[PDB]
Design a protein around this ligand. Structure first.
Ligand SMILES: Cc1ncc(COP(=O)(O)O)c(CN[C@@H](CC(=O)O)CC(C)C)c1O
Ligand SMILES: Cc1ncc(COP(=O)(O)O)c(CN[C@@H](CC(=O)O)CC(C)C)c1O
Lengths: 432, 429
């Protein structure tokens, strides 16, 4: 729990950050005049104020006060390609040559859809959206319409987009689906909820690893329970792979040998352009065939926009192939293991959790299995870790998450590991 | 009618023989997407056209045929297919850097332009679509008021999770929505007496867009403004289409202020875009530094392509004066189309405002979803096919949305093809 001594250390770190970044401070005051709190994406705000970036290339960026950083945040997994990938750039140039806002289908949509279907083993048919939020809403829409049922089982700490935020329990802004929340990884508790609610369950919605909720892998016995009970009760199992799809050529489902009924996608698949998708079993997705009587409707001005169709096909087929996915996850597993070794050898009360190229620091010794474990870990030390990494020229999420891009190399990874050893040394007093 | 059914059979068959390369694309696209489709409004029988490329106001399909594009991406495509200023904005965004994972100055600059333009928007937040913008406005209203009921209108279209174009759709997000009749003062007053106490929001377009370019009458919008203030509901004007009609949208033209306003389409320069904005006191509930702040993340909300191209769109291309000029040009165009119908005693009209218009095969008043549905639907489909044969592309449902790239030759060609339709189909009219 919170102490005066940690608060004082945070106050000094905030004061140093403020004195070092006066141009960012002034941008925040101006931004407040047009956006609430100077903000249009809540996760970008942190106190005293966020850094404003001027420019970036490759894995690196520079803030408006002239400091340089390596970007380990990687746009919360969407920024797989760095800030200036030449193949992405060529795809943008091609989109512009085809033409913008053509108001009709192009072949580019079909080619992107075929790449997504080749790549993901339980997606027979796919439709594109403009966000992961839209992909998850459309999957819930599919489930409730098909089953005629209202109840949705999801999990505390689960994050499925702007209208489906359960990171801190029920949010008053959520779309008013009838959502029952379970505890992540809790076999017996979840089995009890499915016995009470199963018969009116339209859908079970779950990430195979909590992303925003702390990079907490799902355990097999938990995912097996969900898969078996969804089938038994006649609910659609929806795996939200908006973050986890990168973890192998075919995402977590290939790693697991477990198939969901629908799968949602987002982040890097559109080449860093706006993007989401929902897809799954043929018989479910065919309900969207507009030639069919009583077809479900799914419009959306930018669903098939040329920039996303072109960059996305390039991302999946020319850059982040299935082999590149295996190699990046192996690189990430080695990185994460090295960071935990540094913690263990120094007897530090911290660990990094995650899979492949995704991980999050948690200031705890306990196994990290559910949202409760994440919230019980020390939140002050997590904020102090954020400001420390900044001083060392390493940018990662305020909540302690990194997501390795393809542009991170040896020098970047070595600097992160060094910075961590330094944090442990310099903050030993607060780590008892 | 049997005679009209045969004319449609013949036109569908002729379209099919004209476009065998698009036919083969459709067979292949069915393999990976449901019905070969990722945006339902693009499908039409016997199959949709596939386009290969376009420049300015013109495109070419995969069979080689050229068209003037009068659809203009359902109002988003205001800049044509290759605007040099949009292109420069994309090049500047690439120079700044993609996926920078942080704020840049560009987002504040875009937001300043949006708040400057729209007279009831004190503060704004960006989304990735109009659908997201409307869902967040509903989230704001229900979360602030603590109430569940939303009044919307039959014919109304607010996005993929809020589609009332044919009444309640089974796929809509399960807000407790009550549907009135558009422009119906009596019936709508009644619904507000019954539901006012539990009403979080009144959600309404100042002109039905997808529902058929049907302008809202002043008495109807006055009713909604007065009742919303009386019962404590948030009035939400969905200006995703109508924002273009003046520099400050429909609200500037009307002198009526909604509590929240949703935006989309052309404002992000053609890039993915939506926004919700309004009264300062409502929007501050999203200040992330405030006590019990509402959360609104979204990976692409502040994306550099949208922020740069949208800033350019509002400040360099579609200025307040450009907006007045296009809407005037659009009013004169639509008047000419109606004069042609009138002079040829044709049983059709075009409804709309400024640069937006839709054909309806009826001479009755078009004031609600009922009136649009009652007009001849078979003649509407024949008209689409006929315009294609003349090298004019507009929506299957008979809507146009003039871009800045439409010029004298295109408008003249549209008008002559309308006159040709009336003469060639005289027997069915
Ligand atoms: C598992 C999962 N499922 C859905 C979403 C929503 O995707 P969009 O942000 O594209 O709407 C997300 C989005 N995650 C991030 C969105 C942002 O960076 O603004 C935010 C979270 C770290 C809270 C996700 O992680
Ligand atoms: C008044 C209004 N309000 C909200 C929306 C939703 O915008 P997004 O399609 O960008 O989500 C729309 C979008 N309508 C368009 C969607 C598309 O082109 O696929 C076209 C409609 C005729 C169905 C709108 O017209």
């Amino acid at each position: 729990s919170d102490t005066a001594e940690k608060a004082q250390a945070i106050a000094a770190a905030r004061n140093t950050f403020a004195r070092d970044n006066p141009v960012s401070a002034g941008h925040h005051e101006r931004a407040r005049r047009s956006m609430p709190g100077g903000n249009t994406r809540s996760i970008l705000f942190h106190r005293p104020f966020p850094l404003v970036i001027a420019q970036g290339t490759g894995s690196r960026f520079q803030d408006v006060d002239g400091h340089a950083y390596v970007n380990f945040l990687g746009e919360y997994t969407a920024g797989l390609f760095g800030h200036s990938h030449p193949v992405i750039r060529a795809a943008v140039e091609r989109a512009l040559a085809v033409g913008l806002n053509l108001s009709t289908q192009t072949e580019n949509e079909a080619l992107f859809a075929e790449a997504v279907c080749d790549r993901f083993p339980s997606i027979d048919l796919v439709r594109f959206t403009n966000s992961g939020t839209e992909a998850n809403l459309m999957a819930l829409a599919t489930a409730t319409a098909i089953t005629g049922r209202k109840t949705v089982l999801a999990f505390d700490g689960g994050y499925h987009g702007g209208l489906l935020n359960f990171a801190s329990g029920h949010a008053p802004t959520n779309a008013p689906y009838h959502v029952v929340l379970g505890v992540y990884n809790d076999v017996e508790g979840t089995a009890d909820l499915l016995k009470r609610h199963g018969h009116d369950c339209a859908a079970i919605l779950v990430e195979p690893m909590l992303g925003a909720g702390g990079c907490v892998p799902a355990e097999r016995a938990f995912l097996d329970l969900l898969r078996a009970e969804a089938s038994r009760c006649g609910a659609l199992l929806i795996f939200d792979e908006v973050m986890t799809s990168r973890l192998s050529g075919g995402g977590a489902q290939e790693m697991l040998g477990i198939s969901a009924d629908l799968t949602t996608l987002g982040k890097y698949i559109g080449g860093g352009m706006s993007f989401g998708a929902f897809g799954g079993r043929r018989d479910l997705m065919e309900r969207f065939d507009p030639a069919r009587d009583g077809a479900f409707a799914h419009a959306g001005t930018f669903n098939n926009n040329i920039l996303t169709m072109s960059a996305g096909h390039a991302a999946l087929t020319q850059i982040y192939t299935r082999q590149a996915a295996s190699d990046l996850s192996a690189s990430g597993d080695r990185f994460r293991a090295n960071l935990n070794r540094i913690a263990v050898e120094n007897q530090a009360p911290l660990q990094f959790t995650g899979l492949g190229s995704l991980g999050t620091i948690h200031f705890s010794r306990a196994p990290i299995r559910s949202a409760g474990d994440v919230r019980a870990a020390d939140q002050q030390l997590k904020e102090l870790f954020f400001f420390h990494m900044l001083r060392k020229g390493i940018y990662l999420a305020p909540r302690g998450m990194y997501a390795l891009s393809l542009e991170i190399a040896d020098a970047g990874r070595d600097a992160f590991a060094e910075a961590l050893a330094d944090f442990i040394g310099e903050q030993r007093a607060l780590l008892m």
